[PDB]
């Protein structure tokens, strides 16, 4: 039962690689940690601008280890004024089971991977990236994002409680996109992000006609 260190991983364009910890939290058996990279279409990329090494490794029961996300110079074919999307997976391979009729299940994490160029390299401080522009239309809001960064909005509501607790189908907004989402009109709205570091903040808004900026 190996697992990752973080929910989501941000690749710095300045740097050549990065290490992600894994750990075999099962202490009775050894496991193999298959690790790989996928493109924005969630397909495998084997020579791809980013690669993960090693593709497989034995973790002895209880043993913690790493994986290395890294670059190939076909990264220069990527756009440098905005993040590009990948996903880093990890699949546990169990010891083939003792002989009986048995269905064997295998956990696999699949986090997001953000190639972020050096040109758009964020402040060490959690930078805002708060510029967002909820526009009212029939059926709800249409959320603008003219930042050069990927942004997953996890909730929308009337208050900080509703955004935190209330049901909502999560949406990831590509950099420089506008997208319609279904929601009741709110006099004062509240959108809940997921920041680089992983925690879920809440932005609060001020609606001046159709356009609603943050407070």
């Amino acid at each position: 039962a190996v697992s990752l260190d973080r929910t989501r991983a941000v690749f710095d364009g300045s740097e050549k690689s990065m290490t992600l910890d894994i750990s075999n939290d099962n202490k009775q058996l050894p496991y193999l940690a298959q690790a790989w990279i996928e493109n924005e279409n969630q397909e495998k990329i084997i020579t791809g601008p980013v690669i993960a090494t090693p593709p497989v490794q034995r973790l002895e029961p209880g043993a913690k280890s790493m994986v290395r996300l890294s670059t190939t110079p076909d990264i220069s074919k990527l756009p440098q004024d905005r993040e590009s999307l990948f996903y880093f997976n990890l699949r546990e391979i169990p010891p083939r089971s003792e002989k009986a009729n048995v269905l064997q299940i295998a956990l696999q994490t699949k986090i997001k991977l953000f190639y972020r160029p050096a040109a758009i390299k964020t402040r060490p401080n959690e930078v805002w990236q708060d510029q967002l522009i909820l526009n009212k239309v029939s059926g709800g809001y249409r959320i603008e994002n003219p930042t050069p960064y990927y942004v997953t909005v996890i909730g929308l509501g009337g208050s900080e409680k509703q955004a935190e607790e209330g049901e909502f189908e999560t949406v990831m907004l590509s950099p420089r996109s506008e997208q319609t989402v279904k929601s009741a009109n709110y006099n004062t709205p509240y959108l809940s992000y997921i920041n680089d570091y992983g925690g879920r903040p809440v932005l609060s808004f001020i609606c001046n006609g159709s356009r609603c900026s943050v407070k």
Partner: protein, 316 residues
Amino acid sequence: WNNIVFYSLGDVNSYQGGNVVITQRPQFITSWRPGIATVTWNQCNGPEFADGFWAYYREYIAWVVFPKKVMTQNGYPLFIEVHNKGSWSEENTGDNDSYFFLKGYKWDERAFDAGNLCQKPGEITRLTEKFDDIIFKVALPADLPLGDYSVKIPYTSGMQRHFASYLGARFKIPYNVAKTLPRENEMLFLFKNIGGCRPSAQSLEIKHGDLSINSANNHYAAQTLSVSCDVPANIRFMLLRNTTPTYSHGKKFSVGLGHGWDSIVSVNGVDTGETTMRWYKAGTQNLTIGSRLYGESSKIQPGVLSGSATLLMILP
């Protein structure tokens, strides 16, 4: 005659590890820095002072006695790990309490420089030699409380000196005594634990006892996984197919168990093979993986069944 002297730099500084999940391991960097290093221990068995008349051989070695473990003021105990040591030589696995990093600068340097060969405790010199930074990455238990931390970590750091009469001088401070030296240099470490969810750490086998030949047609069994959590969280679960099934079920998810037998695998009562567990408030939640068997006499075959699946968690 052999003569040993040590100085402790007593460096002070802080490092922001920033916001991390409980499973994430934050980091800090223990820089060696020049400064005014005070003597705190020595072993002298030769001339007190040095003059121009007679030569003597040298050996200078660095030291950083960094503690293996620390406990937060909250009372929870942190664990430290060596991410990147550098050209430093760690030289003591056997002892549990502290790491022992050291570096030999000089060895058999035949010098005539007159001055003090045994500065007694309380005296000082201006050390002006650089070394690599030693990086540390910290381990946090799941029970760590959420919020801001400020763990003050004491350590010793300093340059051992060895003036000698004999050629091929080889004298080093013992590890036991190195531990007892004043931990004059320590650097505060600040980090923030946002917290995060972690699934159950166990074998996921689902067992059916009897082959039963044909009779075990629609046999059922299932098993459950805990998924603990500190904060609010969405975890999209998706059963994935490894072993390709023999028969076809329309929108139901299926897996080949071999010998013309499938398992329609489900998760929280879902034949579709995808669910979503959500956390508004903290605490664990169970995830129930059904295996329903299925075969048909046309291709029923005697033999031991086994298949597999991959319950994929798409953490957004």
